[PDB]
Amino acid sequence: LGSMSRRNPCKFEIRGHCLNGKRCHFSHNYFEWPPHALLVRQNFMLNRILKSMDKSLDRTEEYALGVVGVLESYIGSINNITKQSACVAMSKLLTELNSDDIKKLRDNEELNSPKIRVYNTVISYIESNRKNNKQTIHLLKRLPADVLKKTIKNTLDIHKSITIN
Amino acid sequence: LGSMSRRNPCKFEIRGHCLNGKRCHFSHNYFEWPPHALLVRQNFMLNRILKSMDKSLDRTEEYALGVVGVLESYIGSINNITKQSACVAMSKLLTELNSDDIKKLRDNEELNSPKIRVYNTVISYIESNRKNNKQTIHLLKRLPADVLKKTIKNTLDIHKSITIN
Amino acid sequence: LGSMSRRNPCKFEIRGHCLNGKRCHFSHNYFEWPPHALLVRQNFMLNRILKSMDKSLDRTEEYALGVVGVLESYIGSINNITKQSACVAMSKLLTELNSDDIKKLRDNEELNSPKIRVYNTVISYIESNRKNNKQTIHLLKRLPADVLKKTIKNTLDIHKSITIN
Amino acid sequence: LGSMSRRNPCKFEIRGHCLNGKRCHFSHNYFEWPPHALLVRQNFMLNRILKSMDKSLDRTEEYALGVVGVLESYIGSINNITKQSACVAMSKLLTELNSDDIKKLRDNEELNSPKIRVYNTVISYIESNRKNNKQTIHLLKRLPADVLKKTIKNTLDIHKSITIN
């Protein structure tokens, strides 16, 4: 008939690599895992590969707000958000976006629509931020509050927009 | 019975990383996502990892044509495509192909078939372009129009061919 | 009707790349593979990409214990584990964890809970270990046994905890 | 009712990135793809990421034999395989294996089994080859034919063995 039983996938392994040696009784053999476990492991591992190739507001309130909450809070001068913090979070936001999405938007516009100007500006900041975020940050720090908060607002709008169409 | 409800996966997270902190009510826990969402996220994340390890015609018309449309347009002297532009797009095309596919084609040929010569040329350009695209581009810029447009045409033919067999 | 038969996926390819040339009769065409095989291959390949971007207790007993067994054994002065070995294994453990998980834990705490202090310490070690494990290791080697074994114990507790909630 | 129809995924995109701009009528939206297509794309993309992070017998006969056929052919002095070629192919074979698999084998052995010696040798070559294949190759070229062919044979045996258990 077979064995009564099969071994379940190891939860440590689903998150990366099990560090428990032979002491461990769960399965570490991908050929016997159900698909869901293998799909979950792939997402943990992709996060790890991506983090380990990255180049270089950790407190409780900032974490709960996230980069978006911090940026929204700076624009409304609430929650005690400095301009320094808002400029780091902005780099983080720009790293999360990608130009190719701005470009699909950009080409849905009537010619010399004013929105084409804002797109190309955000696109420009993504590229710069990709090259060197530390440079890019400084650059945001020199912008006057009013214009900074407007660029930010533009970026957040596009961020949301891309994700809900 | 359980709860009446389960949380849906977060669309921001499906595209990368949700930047909305604790403010966000959607699921960010891969163990509770349905498979489709996890498969979609993997493709967004692979695109990101691949882009962030790359080394270095953005206008509306070029974007709509794509690298292939630009290359086809240069060969027919339409759409206002410079030789410079056609040589960049060609590098982009060569980055998208891979030698191993030319080689499976190459070994379907009668010995000293003339097609073996063209394959080994494209293969040669992929390798060069991999090493340094900027060098490779210059090299394409010095080729005479007639021969350039023929090499291009060869590359596009193989590109299409690999994808429809 | 079709052919009586389809080719099965190649087990070498499921693990990476088949090195058997045309001599091989199994399928190497991902369009004809069943989903399970493609999910298994992705996990082998992600392990390979991750290993090939990493920067730099191999014996039988250590391997069976794993990094966790080694660390648990040092704390109880059994199994013949040196302080050197325990500090390498600790780096390996810290590479396997990620800060973002400590931070989700950290924000479940009453303000000035003593546990917040320990979290921020582990978080601090992950970041350091990420920067340079060799530096980080030395740093662990200078800590006095009693405190080392306590930091270790904290790390293992969090490791287990993250994985079973 | 909905539309009569849905767009099929783009075969170019399944293999990487479609370079056909807006001219293209197939779907490039991963949210509407069926799972199989998304699983196939992930394997093409993982191959690309892996190739683009690699560091540095292309002829018809060699390609058909593959690295394994070349190595088997050298050992039997057939097919016109030089010692140089056999040493490159050997590096390629060593890149495809991974130590962690030799180690699971190694710990299935009675103590001071002679097989433990051979494992640790192969393991040693993988690590060296990982560090610098060009160095590692030279090193294989200096080994005397008889011993080379024996090391090779050991490596192939383990390669096959790992894959069929």
Count of beta carbons in the 10 Å neighbourhood of residue A63: 19
Separation between Cα atoms, residue C142 and residue D23, nearest integer Å: 64
CB-based contact (8 Å) between C11 and chain A?
no
Instruction: For residues C119 and C99, give the distance between their C-alpha atoms in angstroms, rounded to a whole number.
Output: 9
Task: Kindly determine whether residue D21 and residue B93, on different chains, have CB atoms separated by under 8 Å.
Answer: no
Total residues found in chain D within this entry: 165
Query: How far apart, in whole angstroms, are the C-alpha atoms of residue A58 and residue A66?
Result: 10
Q: How far is Cα of residue A2 from the mean position of the Cα atoms in its chain?
A: 46
Find residue B9's DSSP bridge partners: B27
CA torsion sign for C141, C147, C149, C151 is negative
Where do the H-state alpha helices sit in chain B? 11-15, 35-51, 60-75, 83-96, 99-106, 115-131, 133-141, 145-163
- Token pair listed for D146: 């008889």
Residue A77: other Cβ atoms inside 10 A = 10
CA distance D128 to D160: 21
- Whether D97 and D65 have beta carbons less than 8 Å apart is answered as no
Distance of CA C74 to CAs A20, C71, C89, C121, Å?
A: 14, 5, 10, 21
- Tokens linked to D120: 């640790």
Collapsing DSSP to helix, strand or coil, C84 comes out as helix
DSSP symbol at D40: H
Residue pair C32/C7 in contact (Cβ under 8 Å)? The answer is yes
Supply A68's token pair: 């978006």
Please judge whether A68 and B42 are an interchain contact, meaning their C-beta atoms are less than 8 angstroms apart.
no
If 0-12 CB within 10 Å is exposed, 13-18 middle and 19+ buried, where does residue C56 land?
Answer: exposed
Tokens of B37: 């969402």
Give A-chain residues touching D22 at CB under 8 angstroms.
Answer: 107
Question: What is the C-alpha to C-alpha distance for residues B74 and B61, in angstroms, rounded to an integer?
Answer: 13
Q: Which residues contact D134 (CB under 8 A, 6 or more apart)?
A: none
Residues of C in contact with A19 (CB under 8 A): 66-68, 92-93, 96, 159
Angle formed at CA A16 by CA A10 and CA A19, multiple of 5 degrees: 65
What is the signed CA dihedral for A53, A58, A64, A67, rounded to 10 degrees?
-50
Any chains having at least 3 CB pairs less than 8 A from chain B are: A, C, D
Query: CB contacts < 8 Å between A and D, how many?
Result: 3
Q: Which residues of B touch A43 (CB under 8 A)?
A: 30, 38, 41-42, 45
Going along chain D from its start, the domains and CATH numbers come out as: 1-165 (1.20.120.1350)
List all residues 6 or more positions away from A19 whose beta carbon is below 8 Å from its beta carbon: A12, C66, C67, C68, C92, C93, C96, C159
Neighbours of A40 (CB within 10 A): 22
Classify residue C27 by its DSSP letter: B
Locus of tokens 């039997």: D76
For residue A92, the number of C-alpha atoms closer than 13 Å in the C-beta half-sphere is 19
Question: Long-range contacts: D159-163, Cβ < 8 Å, 24+?
Answer: D159/C19, D159/D68, D159/D93, D159/D96, D159/D97, D161/D105, D162/C15, D162/D97, D162/D101, D162/D105, D163/C11, D163/C12, D163/C15
Alpha carbon of A40: minimum distance to chain B alpha carbons (Å): 6
- Tokens 């060569």, residue located: B94
Question: A56: burial class by Cβ within 10 Å (0-12, 13-18, 19+)?
Answer: exposed
D107 — contact with chain A (CB < 8 Å)?
A: yes
At how many Å resolution was this determined?
Answer: 2.5
- CA nearest D16: which of B65, B101, B118? B101
- How far separated are the first and last CA of chain C, in Å rounded? 51
HSE-up of residue A145 (Cα within 13 Å, Cβ side): 7
Joined together, the tokens standing for residue A131 give 């090259």
Backbone angles phi and psi of D27, in degrees to 5: -70, 135
Q: Which two tokens stand for residue C34?
A: 């069943």
Coil, strand or helix at B9: strand
- Look at D49 and B50 and tell me if their CB atoms are within 8 Å: yes
Planar angle of CA B69, B72, B73, nearest 5 degrees: 80
Q: What is the 3-state secondary structure (H, E, C) of chain A?
A: CCCCCCCCECHHHHHCCCCCHHHCCCECCHHHCCHHHHHHHHHHHHHHHHHCCCCCCCCHHHHHHHHHHHHHHHHCCCCCCCHHHHHHHHHHHHHHCCHHHHHHHHCCCCCCCCHHHHHHHHHHHHHHHHHCHHHHHHHHHCCCHHHHHHHHHHHHHHHHHHHCC
Q: What gap in Å lies between CA C17 and CA C12, rounded to an integer?
A: 6
Cα-only R_g, chain B: 22
Q: Which C positions 57-96 lie with beta carbon below 8 A of chain A? A: 63-69, 92-93, 96
Q: Would you give the DSSP letter of residue D27?
A: B
Distant-in-sequence, close-in-space partners of C20: CB < 8 Å, separation ≥ 6 = C12, D66, D68, D69
Put simply, whether D98 touches C (Cβ < 8 Å) is yes
Please indicate the experimental technique that yielded this structure: X-ray
Of D11, D35, D46, Cβ closest to residue B39: D35
Using CA atoms, how far apart are residues C132 and D27, in angstroms rounded to an integer?
A: 44
Structure-token pair, residue C165: 């909630």
Query: How far, in Å, CA of D42 to CA of B42, rounded?
Result: 7
- Give helix D145-163 / helix D83-96 axis angle, nearest 10°: 30
CA–CA distances in Å: residue A161 to residues A28, A71, A121, B119 = 41, 16, 16, 44
